Amino acid sequence: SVYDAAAQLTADVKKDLRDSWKVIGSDKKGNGVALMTTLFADNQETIGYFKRLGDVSQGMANDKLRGHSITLMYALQNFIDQLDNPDDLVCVVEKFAVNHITKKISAAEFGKINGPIKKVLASKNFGDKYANAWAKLVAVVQAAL
Amino acid sequence: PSVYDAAAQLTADVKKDLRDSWKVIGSDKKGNGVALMTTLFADNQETIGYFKRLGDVSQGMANDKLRGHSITLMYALQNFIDQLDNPDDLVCVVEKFAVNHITKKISAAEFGKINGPIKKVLASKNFGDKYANAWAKLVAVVQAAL
Ligand code: HEM
Ligand code: HEM
């Protein structure tokens, strides 16, 4: 199932993922927080899952939120690094899905991250082409949820 | 023992030794990650109980779940190393990381067992006691949060 989703990650898709990540991943704290704050802004309901982070309205200044945001970016770093080996990508994606499954986060709920990603990419001038590529990576994760 | 006091123990040379060694160790996350875990299970079989979900841990690299876990583990260390410049970021990242281990009832003493495996992997790459002690200091920051 996850393997089949990984099949959509074509040579061109992987190329666009790596190129956009080279920029997005160069500032994990800044872009990580931008992703989370954008998620909370466009989908306020997702805040219910982050009660532990406290006052998320403080953004970057919130240590727990900042801590979570930075860490989030390293999961993506992991995924990006495993792109050329489907076997490694799959085992890493399934390992990652375990905690989210135990947190009762469905594939549809997880998919809400696509909008924030598209916006963050656009702020760096990466158009729809790149947003679509990323939606495909997110789809691999959704397949495991 | 507070995490803020522990983070202050990461002096200039300790940080430098961490970076120099990670440059080599972090080059092969899959290989070194798996070697780290297998060594932990070999030197401290009592810890295997915490990893029931991984299945047959003796299969090593062949075990997909163990491999997935091992690779991921290395990115958490990558995270710590990248935050060495800012004590505030290192701390929030460490406490974040401590949450899931606290939930699995992993104590500071239990976590400290990783020091053995780290020392052996380092030695296999010609990094001696100086570096093992540097890593022990980093591990201590996490212990202070458990
Ligand atoms: C590209 C998307 C995402 C990435 C890379 C990501 C990454 C991570 C990572 C690495 C962790 C920390 C380790 C763990 O506990 O599993 C985490 C925790 C968590 N994630 Fe995800 N995640 C993503 C999207 C989401 C979404 C969309 C939701 C919910 C709507 C979500 C909810 C959670 C929650 C509630 C936690 C615990 C946070 C805490 O209390 O510290 N994640 N995620
Ligand atoms: C260098 C030290 C270590 C690092 C960097 C590390 C890193 C990680 C990471 C990133 C995860 C995945 C995210 C999560 O579920 O929280 C994890 C999971 C886990 N860790 Fe640690 N860990 C270390 C040492 C230990 C030790 C010594 C134990 C136990 C004696 C331990 C027990 C666990 C367990 C039980 C899991 C869940 C495994 C699974 O079910 O997939 N960890 N660790």
Swiss-Prot record, chain B:
It is found in: Cytoplasm. Gene3D superfamilies: Globins. The keyword Membrane does not apply. InterPro entries: Globin, Globin-like_OT, Globin-like_sf, Globin/Proto, Mb-like_M. It comes from the Eukaryota. Keywords: Cytoplasm, Heme, Iron, Metal-binding, Oxygen transport, Transport. Its main location: cytoplasm. Heme b binds at H101. It holds the Pfam family Globin. Belongs to the globin family. Homodimer. This is Globin-1.
